[PDB]
Amino acid sequence: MAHHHHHHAMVIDHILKCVFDKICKIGTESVEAGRLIELSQEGGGGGGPLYFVVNVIEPCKKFSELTGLVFYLPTDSGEKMTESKSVLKSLTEKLKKIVELIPSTSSAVPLIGKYMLFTKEFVESSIKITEEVINTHHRS
């Protein structure tokens, strides 16, 4: 869209809506395959449908502030990002362990898992975009 050779704050704060936009495109669309696949098996388990949004949004919350610390308080070409990404892989560890509580729904692991890695590979965009500004960040 533009370049504007200068400090990063006015034009850098705008890019946020650029990376946060797509996230909703494929992120909001998954809201269907997530409830469609679950309900197909049972959509319940140890509790109700709130356990799916409570366990999914739980980790997302702490990340909500992270998405704002990368487009506002950048520590590097992908510091706050690469540091927050490690949480996405370590987070699933809590969902995969569900087999110890309700292994009945675990059968969906290989079902919904197709979407899991999907976003995991999309979140990388965070460091991808910054790869364009790194040209200056790295230098100075």
Which domains, and CATH codes, for the chain?
1-140 (1.20.58.390)
Task: Give the whole-angstrom CA distance, residue 110 versus residue 13.
Answer: 38
Task: Give the other-Cβ count within 10 Å of 82's Cβ.
Answer: 14
* Cβ contact 79:135 at 8 Å: no
Strand segments, DSSP code E, in 69-108 are none
Discontinuities after residues in the chain (C–N over 2.5 A) = none
Sequence letter at residue 132: E
Task: Give the other-Cβ count within 10 Å of 7's Cβ.
Answer: 9
Q: What angle do CA 117, 119, 120 make, to 5 degrees?
A: 55
Can you read off the two tokens belonging to residue 8?
A: 């990063």
Experimental method: NMR
Q: Which of 38, 39, 20 is nearest to 28 (CA)?
A: 20
Task: Give the whole-angstrom CA distance, residue 21 versus residue 27.
Answer: 10
Please provide the size of the chain in residues: 140
Task: Give the whole-angstrom CA distance, residue 78 versus residue 99.
Answer: 34
Phi, psi (degrees; rounded to nearest 5) at 52? -80, -35
SS3 129: helix
SS3 122: helix
Residue with tokens 């960040």: 137
Can you read off the two tokens belonging to residue 72?
A: 């506002």
Task: Give the whole-angstrom CA distance, residue 14 versus residue 16.
Answer: 5
Can you read off the two tokens belonging to residue 5?
A: 């050779």
* CA 108 to mean position of chain CA atoms: 20
Longest dimension (CA), the chain: 56
Helix ranges (DSSP H) in the chain: 15-41, 50-64, 66-69, 79-96, 109-122, 125-139
Task: Give the other-Cβ count within 10 Å of 138's Cβ.
Answer: 9
Task: Give the whole-angstrom CA distance, residue 35 versus residue 44.
Answer: 11
* Cβ contact 70:81 at 8 Å: yes
- How far CA 66 is from CA of 78, 82, 88, in Å, comes to 12, 11, 12
Residue with tokens 């950048």: 74
